[PDB]
């Protein structure tokens, strides 16, 4: 039986949560009830399962399981056509309602009138808004969210208490997801492969100690927790997170230093300790790169004897020595080396051939480099809502066609990149941004993939994981856009308008200016500047009241 080895692993606990989850990324749309319901059912069935190893339908898959339960055009299908069917259904934008919280007094209520519904609760919305928020990282921010209402429900003050801490999850949550929606993406739309290389080159940059073998042994294992877990196998994607979590505290002394303050704590928090750790220290005199793949002339007959490991190899040391590059910068790296090597050993002398290949480095290092030097001089010069006008001007022409609340979604995050990257050393700063970056662009990427409405977009989306950054960076403004003309709908008076808080108003007029940039593209930063501020002046004084909708009409 598959569903007692596992009920046995996780617990019944984490096993109820897993179930959950797993069916609220399903069947978005479906009630919270409805869920539970199918759980329980799901939980129960596999207790007998526990006592009776042989016991009726316990030989079964727990895709076939869960298959059978959610379906009571995807269903009328079988294993595992039908599994896929409700992979390929899964929607990162789901038209559900916004998530907003009642009075504080009035949660807390609840959350004492009833615990656990309360936290499935949550549970449940978070899964079902994101399809594809990793699991077992779900469990963690759960027991964070527990601990929360259990400590600020119990004070003088609550809503100074609690607030505080909901916001900072929401956001964490938020990262989270994205972050885990390119290992997904990646997975998925370019292959293991490619997501293995990523791994490599940046377990060998969190561990410069660990030997090659003992990171293959990590990205292999890695990359069969990820797969699962964006396959929609969440039990097992635990179950195999954990033993991983186990495997490298016990070799703790062969990877990392840092790993010893994550490795005594809970099972969950060592989890989520181990995938924020720093970079180890790097080992001292390490031997030159080229003198073993450029100078030694053994570096073709290693390319076909066994390219794949030798070009690991590569990655490996090439990672490992610098924790100043990003991920997808030494991914450029490493193709570039391999297509050197493609065409240098097959010419007359290859060792002249290739001997030149890191010369072909310096640009594509140097490009990244000035880019976060040049937006972080800005950040300073304009603070982070500033910044992220002009990036939302800037990528407004680029891409005129996407939507609106998606160009000022991304715009704003893209705009984040200012004020979590700059206030580090250079050396730290291409990592944080540029792989910060990444994610961004692929929330671009999926959002647009739903409604495809930019060739421009699509093919810098799906011609190349590692060039995506440099592909937007290098797009100009698109002239082949039509000036989208004056709607008005767009500004219909509404009350909450004149009651917006700082954050509130700042979106609106970001949303008003990328209407405005649609509107008339050719607009100089002066000429946006004065009709925007008349604009704001106008609103402004349209909510000094009296009959406000009047004035506004
Ligand atoms: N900035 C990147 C870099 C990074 C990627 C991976 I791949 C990784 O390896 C794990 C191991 C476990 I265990 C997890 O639960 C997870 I998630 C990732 C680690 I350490 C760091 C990120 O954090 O995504
Ligand atoms: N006044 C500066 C010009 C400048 C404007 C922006 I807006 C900017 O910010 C981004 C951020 C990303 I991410 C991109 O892909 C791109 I293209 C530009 C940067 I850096 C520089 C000068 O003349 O030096
Ligand atoms: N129609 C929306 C409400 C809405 C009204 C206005 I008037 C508006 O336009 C501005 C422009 C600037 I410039 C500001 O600083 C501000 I605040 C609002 C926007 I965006 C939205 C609804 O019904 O939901
Ligand atoms: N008389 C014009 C109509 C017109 C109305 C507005 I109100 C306006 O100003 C803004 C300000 C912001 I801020 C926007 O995001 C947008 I879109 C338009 C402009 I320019 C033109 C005609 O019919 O030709």
Same mark, same amino acid.
């Given at each position: 039986s598959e569903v007692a080895h596992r009920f046995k692993d996780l617990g019944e606990e984490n096993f109820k949560a897993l179930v959950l989850i797993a069916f609220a990324q399903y069947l978005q749309q479906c009630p919270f009830e409805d869920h539970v319901k199918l759980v329980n059912e799901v939980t129960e069935f596999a207790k007998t399962c526990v006592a009776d190893e042989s016991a009726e339908n316990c030989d079964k898959s727990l895709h076939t399981l869960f298959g059978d339960k959610?379906?009571?055009?995807?269903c009328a299908k079988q294993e595992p056509e039908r599994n896929?069917?409700?992979?390929?259904?899964?929607?990162?934008?789901?038209?559900?309602?916004?998530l907003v919280r009642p009075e504080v007094d009035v949660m807390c209520t609840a959350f004492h009138d009833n615990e656990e519904t309360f936290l499935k609760k949550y549970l449940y919305e978070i899964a079902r808004r994101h399809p594809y928020f990793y699991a077992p990282e779900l469990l963690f921010f759960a027991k964070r969210y527990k601990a929360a209402f259990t400590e600020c429900c119990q004070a003088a003050?609550?809503?100074?208490?609690?607030?505080?801490?909901?916001?900072? @999850?929401?956001?964490?949550?938020?990262? $989270?997801s994205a972050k885990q929606r390119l290992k997904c993406a990646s997975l998925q739309k370019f292959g293991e492969r490619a997501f293995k290389a990523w791994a490599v080159a940046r377990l060998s940059q969190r561990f410069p100690k660990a030997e090659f073998a003992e /990171?293959?042994?990590?990205?292999?294992?890695?990359?069969? /927790?990820?797969?699962?877990?964006?396959?929609?196998? @969440?039990?097992?994607?635990?179950?195999?997170?954990?033993?991983?979590?186990?495997?490298?505290?016990?070799?703790?002394?062969?990877? $990392?230093?840092?790993?010893?303050?994550?490795?005594?704590?809970?099972?969950?928090?060592?989890?989520?300790?181990?995938?924020?750790?720093?970079?180890?220290?790097?080992?001292?005199?390490?031997?030159?790169?080229?003198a073993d793949f450029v100078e030694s002339k053994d570096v073709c007959k290693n390319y076909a004897e066994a390219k794949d490991v030798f070009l690991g190899m590569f990655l490996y040391e090439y990672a490992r020595r610098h924790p100043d590059y990003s991920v997808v910068l030494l991914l450029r790296l490493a193709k570039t080396y391999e297509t050197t090597l493609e065409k240098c050993c097959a010419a007359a002398d290859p060792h002249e051939c290739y001997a030149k290949v890191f010369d072909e480095f310096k640009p594509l290092v140097?490009?990244?480099?000035? @880019?976060?030097?040049?937006?972080?001089?800005?950040?300073?010069?304009?603070?982070?809502y500033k910044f992220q006008n002009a990036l939302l001007v800037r990528?407004?022409?680029?891409?005129?066609? /996407? $939507?609106?609340?998606?160009?000022?979604? /991304?715009?704003?995050?893209?705009?984040?990149?200012?004020?979590?990257?700059?206030?580090?050393?250079?050396?730290?700063r291409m990592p944080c941004a540029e792989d910060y970056l990444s994610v961004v662009l692929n929330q671009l990427c999926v959002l647009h993939e739903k409604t495809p409405v930019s060739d421009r977009v699509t093919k810098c989306c799906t011609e190349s994981l590692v060039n995506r950054r440099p592909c937007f960076s290098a797009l100009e403004v698109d002239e082949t856009y039509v000036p989208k003309e004056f709607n008005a709908e767009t500004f219909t008076f509404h009350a909450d308008i004149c009651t917006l808080s700082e954050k509130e108003r700042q979106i609106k007029k970001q949303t008003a200016l990328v209407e405005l940039v649609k509107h008339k593209p050719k607009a100089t930063k002066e000429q946006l500047k004065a009709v925007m501020d008349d604009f704001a002046a106008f609103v402004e004084k349209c909510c000094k009241a009296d009959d406000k909708e009047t004035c506004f009409a």
């Open positions: 959610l379906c009571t055009d995807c896929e069917c409700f992979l390929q259904h899964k929607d990162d934008n789901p038209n559900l309602p916004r003050d609550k809503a100074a208490c609690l607030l505080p801490k909901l916001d900072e @999850l929401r956001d964490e949550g938020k990262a $989270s /990171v293959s042994k990590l990205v292999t294992d890695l990359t069969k /927790v990820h797969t699962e877990c964006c396959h929609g196998d @969440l039990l097992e994607c635990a179950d195999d997170r954990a033993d991983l979590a186990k495997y490298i505290c016990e070799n703790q002394d062969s990877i $990392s230093s840092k790993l010893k303050e994550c490795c005594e704590k809970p099972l969950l928090e060592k989890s989520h300790c181990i995938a924020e750790v720093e970079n180890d220290e790097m080992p001292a005199d390490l031997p030159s790169l080229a140097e490009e990244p480099q000035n @880019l976060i030097k040049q937006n972080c001089e800005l950040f300073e010069q304009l603070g982070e990528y407004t022409k680029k891409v005129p066609q /996407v $939507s609106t609340p998606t160009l000022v979604e /991304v715009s704003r995050n893209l705009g984040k990149v200012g004020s979590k990257c700059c206030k580090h050393p250079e050396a730290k």
